[PDB]
Write an enzyme that holds these catalytic residues in place. Structure first.
Site, PDB file in Angstrom:
ATOM      1  N   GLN A  57      -1.678   2.417   0.009  1.00 58.78           N
ATOM      2  CA  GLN A  57      -2.121   2.215   1.385  1.00 58.78           C
ATOM      3  C   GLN A  57      -1.675   0.860   1.924  1.00 58.78           C
ATOM      4  OE1 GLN A  57      -6.329   3.011   1.718  1.00 58.78           O
ATOM      5  NE2 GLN A  57      -6.075   5.210   1.353  1.00 58.78           N
TER       6      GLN A  57
ATOM      7  N   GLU B 210     -15.061  -2.245 -12.594  1.00 56.28           N
ATOM      8  CA  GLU B 210     -13.908  -3.017 -12.136  1.00 56.28           C
ATOM      9  C   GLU B 210     -13.746  -4.359 -12.846  1.00 56.28           C
ATOM     10  OE1 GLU B 210     -13.016  -3.049  -8.009  1.00 56.28           O
ATOM     11  OE2 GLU B 210     -14.093  -1.186  -7.586  1.00 56.28           O
TER      12      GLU B 210
ATOM     13  N   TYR C 146     -10.535  -0.023   5.505  1.00 57.27           N
ATOM     14  CA  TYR C 146      -9.325  -0.291   4.737  1.00 57.27           C
ATOM     15  C   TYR C 146      -8.133  -0.517   5.654  1.00 57.27           C
ATOM     16  CZ  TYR C 146     -11.455   0.842   0.213  1.00 57.27           C
ATOM     17  OH  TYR C 146     -12.228   0.850  -0.927  1.00 57.27           O
TER      18      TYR C 146
ATOM     19  N   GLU D  30      13.330 -17.810  -6.899  1.00 51.85           N
ATOM     20  CA  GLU D  30      12.910 -19.032  -6.227  1.00 51.85           C
ATOM     21  C   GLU D  30      11.398 -19.120  -6.064  1.00 51.85           C
ATOM     22  OE1 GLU D  30      15.434 -19.724  -2.926  1.00 51.85           O
ATOM     23  OE2 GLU D  30      14.487 -21.621  -2.347  1.00 51.85           O
TER      24      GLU D  30
HETATM   25  N1  LIG Z   1      -7.457  -4.132   0.471  1.00 51.85           N
HETATM   26  C1  LIG Z   1      -7.568  -2.881   0.032  1.00 51.85           C
HETATM   27  N2  LIG Z   1      -8.257  -2.623  -1.136  1.00 51.85           N
HETATM   28  C2  LIG Z   1      -8.374  -1.354  -1.592  1.00 51.85           C
HETATM   29  C3  LIG Z   1      -7.806  -0.299  -0.891  1.00 51.85           C
HETATM   30  N3  LIG Z   1      -8.077   0.840  -1.563  1.00 51.85           N
HETATM   31  C4  LIG Z   1      -8.795   0.532  -2.668  1.00 51.85           C
HETATM   32  N4  LIG Z   1      -8.997  -0.822  -2.691  1.00 51.85           N
HETATM   33  C5  LIG Z   1      -9.709  -1.583  -3.729  1.00 51.85           C
HETATM   34  O1  LIG Z   1      -9.269  -1.103  -4.982  1.00 51.85           O
HETATM   35  C6  LIG Z   1     -10.326  -1.052  -5.915  1.00 51.85           C
HETATM   36  C7  LIG Z   1     -10.285   0.285  -6.649  1.00 51.85           C
HETATM   37  O2  LIG Z   1      -8.949   0.633  -6.938  1.00 51.85           O
HETATM   38  P1  LIG Z   1      -8.240   1.938  -6.317  1.00 51.85           P
HETATM   39  O3  LIG Z   1      -6.868   1.606  -5.779  1.00 51.85           O
HETATM   40  O4  LIG Z   1      -9.104   2.515  -5.224  1.00 51.85           O
HETATM   41  O5  LIG Z   1      -8.182   2.978  -7.553  1.00 51.85           O
HETATM   42  P2  LIG Z   1      -6.804   3.606  -8.115  1.00 51.85           P
HETATM   43  O6  LIG Z   1      -5.743   2.550  -8.299  1.00 51.85           O
HETATM   44  O7  LIG Z   1      -6.323   4.690  -7.180  1.00 51.85           O
HETATM   45  O8  LIG Z   1      -7.164   4.224  -9.562  1.00 51.85           O
HETATM   46  P3  LIG Z   1      -8.185   5.455  -9.781  1.00 51.85           P
HETATM   47  O9  LIG Z   1      -9.415   4.962 -10.506  1.00 51.85           O
HETATM   48  O10 LIG Z   1      -7.506   6.500 -10.630  1.00 51.85           O
HETATM   49  O11 LIG Z   1      -8.568   6.049  -8.445  1.00 51.85           O
HETATM   50  C8  LIG Z   1     -11.615  -1.234  -5.138  1.00 51.85           C
HETATM   51  O12 LIG Z   1     -12.228  -2.430  -5.558  1.00 51.85           O
HETATM   52  C9  LIG Z   1     -11.209  -1.357  -3.684  1.00 51.85           C
HETATM   53  O13 LIG Z   1     -11.861  -2.452  -3.088  1.00 51.85           O
HETATM   54  C10 LIG Z   1      -7.112  -0.550   0.283  1.00 51.85           C
HETATM   55  O14 LIG Z   1      -6.607   0.379   0.909  1.00 51.85           O
HETATM   56  N5  LIG Z   1      -6.994  -1.846   0.743  1.00 51.85           N
END
Ligand SMILES: Nc1nc2c(ncn2[C@@H]2O[C@H](COP(=O)(O)OP(=O)(O)OP(=O)(O)O)[C@@H](O)[C@H]2O)c(=O)[nH]1
Ligand SMILES: Nc1ncnc2c1ncn2[C@@H]1O[C@H](COP(=O)(O)OP(=O)(O)CP(=O)(O)O)[C@@H](O)[C@H]1O
Ligand SMILES: Nc1nc2c(ncn2[C@@H]2O[C@H](COP(=O)(O)OP(=O)(O)O)[C@@H](O)[C@H]2O)c(=O)[nH]1
Ligand SMILES: COc1cc(S(=O)(=O)Oc2ccc3[nH]c(C)cc3c2)cc(OC)c1OC
Ligand SMILES: [Ca+2]
Ligand SMILES: [Ca+2]
Ligand SMILES: [Ca+2]
Ligand SMILES: [Mg+2]
Ligand SMILES: [Mg+2]
Ligand SMILES: [Mg+2]
EC number: 3.6.5.-
Lengths: 54, 344, 423, 438
Positions: free
Chosen positions: D15, D183, D224, D254
């Site tokens: 995303q 996490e 998000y 660099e």
């Molecule tokens: N800034 C930002 N943080 C995100 C976004 N989507 C998820 N996060 C953060 O990512 C963390 C969780 O990781 P995810 O990317 O949602 O999980 P994943 O990498 O798809 O791995 P899975 O457990 O298999 O779903 C959470 O703490 C969220 O705050 C996003 O679109 N933007």
């Protein structure tokens, strides 16, 4: 206060300003630990089926 | 209802503050390791400032200012005044001090010897004093070789001993003015209207270290005249002001307190850009204990600053209530005894 | 597609299961025939989780109806939404379990369990990505208790990498059929400790008290008790059945809710308790949700600590205000949450409210106070077992006293495990 | 022209990468169908923007990116989004079931089944590069895929591309916008196994971005989309040198030279300014001195910490907009007196400055107002160790009771790997203290 290395172009310019002078593992090792984890996973599942068989 | 945790069991000041908060019925005390708190009465050493202000929907306040150790340690205070342009090495209200590292261990050892040798040649008084942050170990010697050999036996500092201190006539003894300063989250400098004088019980002698060190603990053990003149060798402002009007024809507000308020403002405004928590994710307040000495010319000198001071027994009830009023309740409202030192 | 296979066993499991399908079919706009007659496309975005699409845009529940008696399942087939289930998925016997765990688990249910697994296999084979199974049953009878746990054990053998989820109704002397219910419950609990990932502990004592003390019903019927179960089951499956920015699945719930594999028994809660025109504000939903009087497990949360909490708000409301009230509960009663699991409270909001309610909230709590429920069952078990009373009903089916003693020890061990994490 | 390959792993990487490439197309004038009118060399060219975009014979500019996720829902949005015509399906890789917020499930169990496929698709892009610089890896610390599979990918990339740099944009976990209670476990595990493989990592704490959206953009509950659009601005500033003509940070090597003196201390602190709400009619356009001064305010940093209580090792000033060197030097002299900027003794107290004349680009209809000048500061401060301390304390609280550990062991992980990963973090905090001692 000294500006050095002034580079300029069409899209912008850059420089450095100084204020005070100073005073990997191989593919084999990866697959060994990867397949070791799958071995412990397969061992734990076999124990579950052994428990379920009993 | 507010929440607070306690992480300093030996804090006699905040033990009363914690009692007052629970007495209001609107403050709940939690476990020392619970993260969901509004207030923290943290510890002296290694306070976890990096974990504060990270709880969603929780305005967190702590009773210490991060980075304030530069003003409350022996070596850092001398290094601060010398290096800070606001205070300057030409500072007139701080005794001439020098940072001395032990030979076993930057250092200003040769710088101390230069000014010392000048006084001997100039027929001036050449008495100095050595001390460190690891005190109860203080040596007061006129020869420079005695002081340097004692430091070799942590970081120490040597400053000019006040060979002509102000002595109270009924006893010919030395006093020690302690002023309590509270700086809130808005960095307002509040000076407690009440102070104490840790007076001595032995006559000052120019030629022994009992009539020279005016600590409350030292005057209780080494001195047997403890309580001969004033109770607990601690004279309050009301009594000391009267003595000035009768023996010196002056007042405490003019002869002494004007300089004290000046020193307090200069020190705290100097480190404001380094400890201020205005734009920070958490807020800080802290009570400070300033120790002063007055010479015969009615000039106030700064000895050192305490980050964890202990209040007088009589003034605990008034001072600890004032801490809650202007530092704790200002951030966490519920259902004056200070002098605001205005600045910019 | 993350499909779920639903199984309902016994009288309680089928009556509660039938109401569950009746409630969520209405929420997804599925009539008793099986045709969609809703308005919002949100009702069909994740319809495949619980429903199979047939010819002619027909939606059929992925449900399997199991009983050792034909009585209850004949009622379901003649019920309101009876015509929606697959005729093939009605697997039933004739003798019955006689409120006997041994008959369900060892003698009578053994003769029927294989045919049930064929229907389970038939449903699982047609799943793009099967995420697990959910079972509705009681623990105090013989079929849902005995055969249900046997089904769970055999399903785990064939699908060891799938999530096992149960809605398990605990017996209570307040609403009791037989005196041997503690025997059946203790035997079933040991099975659930080892072979389920998540168990929603639905206490009939709690349901009776809510109907009596709160809903002001002098003589609550099983229909009254099952109304509370329907609201809870709809609430705890809202994230599964409706789209959100959480991508909720059974495995994610298990990973975050269960810090230790044996402590996977959840306290469900619901608000507002219904049996009605005033809208409920967000602060009111949160206060009732954590209130013990809205808990379905007949345990006092203040007698223990919350390991993990999952909360679901339903309806059009201020998500800003929801976070305010949820944080208020945590920061106020922080002594009732474990301080060694940071951020152990999860909140999700769904815009679609249940039928008849503008605002609702569903509570899922892994509290160590659930040990009171197992303590209550254990005490009732021991009072009879010390005198070997009614044991002949089980030894006559091939069981031995040692199996009861082992179940009693496992039951008390589970209480010990819940007790150590309370300090 | 030396190419760069972007790799987006997990939901956060996909995303955020979606937001970044949306901003890249706006900055470079590339349409949602891959057509770039300003590009005169059709099907070729060794320009500065070609480091991120390859050109087809039909004139379509295709990003040099690979999107990876163990679940199809997030990447399906890219397949049916506005910029679906940009990529080709080989670049978008999806599984069937995600890692369930489990590092082990994304690293050992489900990652092992897809690691070879991803490397093959990466090699398909690497072969289209005359000289490949390295990789930009976008992922989250918290997610099972973002933590477990990234660490496995970084291990394999160091084997197949040992001479190539690898830069990370990592999302530090925050309770304000979070998805899992484990996490802290995933964050520590993935940092331990990636530390020896990542040359420079830019940590973005979701708490900082959340607060900036609430404070500066007047957003009640940032989404998000709000967070990612702000994050893409920081990423665009950092990568603007790679995509536009310039002389500072012109290649991936660099970044390590200018910001990473110690290889393990490779987590520069990013600070961005100004963040102006587009809902306001006309805000006072801040001056060079004003935006430069904001770089030393904690409220504008991507990780909440106090740089005053930490020594600096390096500092970069990446300006975008109406900025001239005379203003920058005047601002720096003012700041050095008011602020307490203490470098380490073994480093020169200085600032590397880069200016791009093109003003920052914003998404039309977005929340970020168009400004005439902006600055992103990259300072390698020891004060960023506060983030590790917060993360390690949460790790210690759960691990003291061994909570949730069985989920990882059930996938093949050993309990000793937790302590091994944690002891590395304890050493990392020791290294930060040895550099920031007074
Ligand atoms: N800034 C930002 N943080 C995100 C976004 N989507 C998820 N996060 C953060 O990512 C963390 C969780 O990781 P995810 O990317 O949602 O999980 P994943 O990498 O798809 O791995 P899975 O457990 O298999 O779903 C959470 O703490 C969220 O705050 C996003 O679109 N933007
Ligand atoms: N330069 C000087 N001239 C005269 N007397 C001095 C002096 N430096 C220190 N003293 C005396 O020595 C005493 C102890 O010194 P100092 O104030 O450093 O002790 P300490 O650190 O134990 C005080 P606190 O209890 O506030 O920590 C002072 O109270 C004062 O009487
Ligand atoms: N809540 C609820 N509990 C029930 C229902 N029917 C039976 N029970 C409970 O379940 C136990 C009896 O189990 P039952 O389902 O009749 O046994 P089975 O049919 O052989 O599996 C008793 O403790 C009852 O209180 C019901 O419809 N709702
Ligand atoms: C299927 O049921 C649900 C599943 C999910 S989940 O898939 O997002 O799992 C998670 C993710 C993070 C978590 N943090 C904590 C403390 C619990 C937790 C659970 C959330 C729910 O509501 C909050 C559910 O209830 C209907
Ligand atoms: Ca038979
Ligand atoms: Ca071209
Ligand atoms: Ca490398
Ligand atoms: Mg003292
Ligand atoms: Mg019955
Ligand atoms: Mg995911």
């Amino acid at each position: 206060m000294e500006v050095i290395e002034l580079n300029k172009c069409t899209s912008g310019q850059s420089f450095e300003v100084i204020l005070k002078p100073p005073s990997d593992p191989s593919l084999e090792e990866i697959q060994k630990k990867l397949e070791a984890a799958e071995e412990r996973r397969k061992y734990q599942e076999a124990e579950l089926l052994k428990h379920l068989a009993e | 209802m507010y929440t607070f945790v306690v992480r300093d069991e030996n804090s006699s000041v905040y033990a009363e503050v914690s009692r007052l908060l629970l007495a209001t019925g609107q403050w709940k005390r939690l476990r020392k390791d619970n993260p969901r708190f509004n207030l923290m009465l943290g510890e002296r050493n290694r306070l976890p400032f990096g974990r504060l202000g990270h709880e969603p929907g929780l305005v967190q306040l702590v009773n210490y200012y991060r980075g304030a150790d530069k003003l409350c340690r022996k070596a850092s205070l001398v290094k601060l005044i010398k290096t800070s342009p606001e205070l300057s090495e030409s500072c007139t209200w701080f005794p001439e001090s020098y940072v001395i590292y032990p030979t076993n261990l930057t250092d200003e050892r040769e710088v101390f010897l230069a000014a010392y040798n000048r006084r001997r040649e100039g027929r001036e008084g050449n008495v100095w004093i050595a001390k460190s942050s690891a005190g109860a170990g203080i040596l007061i010697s006129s020869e420079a070789s005695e002081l340097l050999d004692f430091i070799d036996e942590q970081v120490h500092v040597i400053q000019k001993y006040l060979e002509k201190p102000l002595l109270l006539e009924p006893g010919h003894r030395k006093f020690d003015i302690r002023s309590w300063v509270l700086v809130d989250h808005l960095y307002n400098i509040y000076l407690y209207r009440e102070g104490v004088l840790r007076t001595s019980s032995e006559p000052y002698n120019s030629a022994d270290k009992t009539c020279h060190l005016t600590n409350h603990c030292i005057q209780k053990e080494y001195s047997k005249n403890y309580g001969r003149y004033e109770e607990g060798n601690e004279m309050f402002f009301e009594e000391f002001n009267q003595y000035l009007m009768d023996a010196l024809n002056t007042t405490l507000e003019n002869s002494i307190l004007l300089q004290i308020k000046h020193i307090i403002r200069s020190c705290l405004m100097c480190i404001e850009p380094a400890i201020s928590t205005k734009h920070l994710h958490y807020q800080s307040f802290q009570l400070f204990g300033f120790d002063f000495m007055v010479d015969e010319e009615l000039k106030v000198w700064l000895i050192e600053v305490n980050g964890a001071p202990a209040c007088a027994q009589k003034l605990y009830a008034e001072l600890c209530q004032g801490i809650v009023d202007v530092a704790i309740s200002s951030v966490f409202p519920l259902a004056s005894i200070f002098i605001k030192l205005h600045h910019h | 597609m993350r499909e779920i296979v639903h199984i309902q066993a016994g009288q309680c499991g089928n009556q509660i299961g039938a109401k569950f399908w009746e409630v969520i079919s209405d929420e997804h706009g599925i009539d008793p025939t099986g045709s969609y007659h809703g308005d919002s496309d949100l009702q069909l975005e994740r319809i495949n989780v619980y429903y199979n699409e047939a010819t002619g845009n027909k939606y059929v529940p992925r449900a399997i109806l199991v009983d050792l008696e034909p009585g209850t399942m004949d009622s379901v087939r003649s019920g309101p939404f009876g015509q929606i289930f697959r005729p093939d998925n009605f697997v039933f016997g004739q003798s019955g379990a006689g409120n006997n765990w041994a008959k369900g688990h060892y003698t009578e249910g053994a003769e029927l369990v294989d045919s049930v697994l064929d229907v389970v296999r038939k449903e699982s084979e047609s799943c793009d990505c099967l995420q697990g199974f959910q079972l509705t049953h009681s623990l105090g009878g013989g079929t849902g208790s005995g055969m249900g746990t046997l089904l769970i054990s055999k399903i785990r053998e064939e699908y060891p990498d799938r999530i096992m989820n149960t809605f398990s109704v605990m017996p209570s002397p307040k609403v009791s059929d037989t005196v041997v219910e503690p025997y059946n419950a203790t035997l079933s609990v040991h099975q659930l400790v080892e072979n389920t990932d998540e168990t929603y502990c639905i206490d009939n004592e709690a349901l009776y008290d809510i109907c009596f003390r709160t809903l002001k019903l002098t003589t609550p019927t099983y229909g009254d008790l099952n109304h509370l179960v329907s609201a809870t089951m709809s609430g705890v499956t809202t994230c599964l059945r409706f789209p959100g920015q959480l991508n909720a699945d059974l495995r994610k719930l298990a990973v975050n809710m269960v810090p230790f594999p044996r402590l996977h028994f959840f306290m469900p809660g619901f608000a507002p308790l219904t049996s009605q025109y005033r809208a409920l504000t967000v602060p009111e939903l949160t206060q009732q949700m954590f209130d013990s009087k809205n808990m379905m497990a007949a345990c006092d949360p203040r007698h223990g600590r919350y390991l993990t909490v999952a909360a679901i708000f339903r309806g059009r409301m201020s998500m800003k205000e929801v976070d305010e009230q949820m944080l208020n509960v945590q920061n106020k009663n922080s002594s009732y949450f474990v301080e060694w699991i940071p951020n152990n409270v999860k909140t999700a909001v769904c815009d679609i409210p249940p039928r008849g309610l503008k605002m609702s909230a569903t509570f899922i709590g892994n509290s160590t106070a659930i040990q009171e429920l197992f303590k209550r069952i254990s005490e009732q078990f021991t009072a009879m077992f010390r005198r070997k009373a009614f044991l002949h009903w089980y030894t006559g089916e091939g069981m031995d006293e040692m199996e009861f003693t082992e179940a009693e020890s496992n039951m008390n061990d589970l209480v010990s495990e819940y007790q150590q994490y309370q300090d | 022209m030396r190419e760069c390959i972007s790799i987006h792993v997990g939901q956060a990487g996909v995303q955020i990468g979606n937001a970044c490439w949306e901003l890249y197309c706006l900055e470079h004038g590339i349409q949602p169908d891959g057509q770039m009118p300003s590009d005169k060399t059709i099907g070729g060219g060794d320009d500065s923007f070609n480091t991120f975009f390859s050109e087809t014979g039909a004139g379509k500019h295709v990003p040099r990116a690979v999107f990876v996720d163990l679940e199809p829902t997030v990447i399906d949005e890219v397949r049916t989004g506005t910029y679906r015509q940009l990529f080709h399906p080989e670049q978008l890789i999806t599984g069937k079931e995600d890692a369930a917020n489990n590092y082990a499930r994304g690293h050992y169990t489900i990652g092992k089944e897809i690691i070879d496929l991803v490397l093959d698709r990466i090699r398909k892009l690497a072969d289209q590069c005359t000289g490949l610089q390295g990789f930009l890896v976008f992922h989250s610390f918290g997610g099972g895929t973002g933590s477990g599979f990234t660490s496995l990918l970084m291990e394999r990339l160091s084997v197949d591309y040992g001479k190539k740099s690898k830069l990370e944009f990592s999302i530090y976990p925050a309770p304000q916008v979070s998805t899992a209670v484990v996490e802290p476990y995933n964050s520590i595990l993935t940092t331990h196994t990636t530390l020896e493989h990542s040359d420079c990592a830019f940590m973005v704490d979701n708490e900082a971005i959340y607060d900036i959206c609430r404070r500066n953009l007047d957003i009640e509950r940032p989404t998000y989309t709000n967070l990612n659009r702000l994050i893409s601005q920081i990423v665009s500033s950092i990568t603007a040198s790679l995509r536009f003509d310039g002389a500072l940070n012109v290649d991936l090597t660099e970044f390590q030279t200018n910001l990473v003196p110690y290889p393990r201390i490779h987590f520069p602190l990013a600070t961005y300014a100004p963040v102006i709400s587009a809902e306001k009619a006309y805000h006072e356009q801040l001056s060079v001195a004003e935006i430069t001064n904001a770089c030393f305010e904690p409220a504008n940093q991507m990780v909440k910490c106090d740089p005053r209580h930490g020594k600096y090792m390096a500092c970069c000033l990446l300006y975008r907009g109406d900025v001239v060197p005379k203003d920058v030097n005047a601002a720096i002299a003012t700041i050095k007196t008011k602020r307490s900027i203490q470098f380490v003794d073994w480093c020169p107290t200085g600032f590397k400055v880069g200016i791009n004349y093109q003003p920052p680009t914003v998404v039309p209809g977005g929340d970020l107002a168009k400004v005439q000048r902006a600055v992103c500061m990259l300072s390698n401060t020891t004060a960023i160790a506060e983030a590790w301390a917060r993360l390690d304390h949460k790790f210690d609280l759960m691990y003291a009771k061994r909570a949730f550990v069985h989920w990882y062991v059930g996938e093949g992980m050993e309990e000793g790997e937790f302590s091994e990963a944690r002891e590395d973090m304890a050493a990392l905090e020791k290294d930060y203290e040895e550099v920031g001692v007074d």
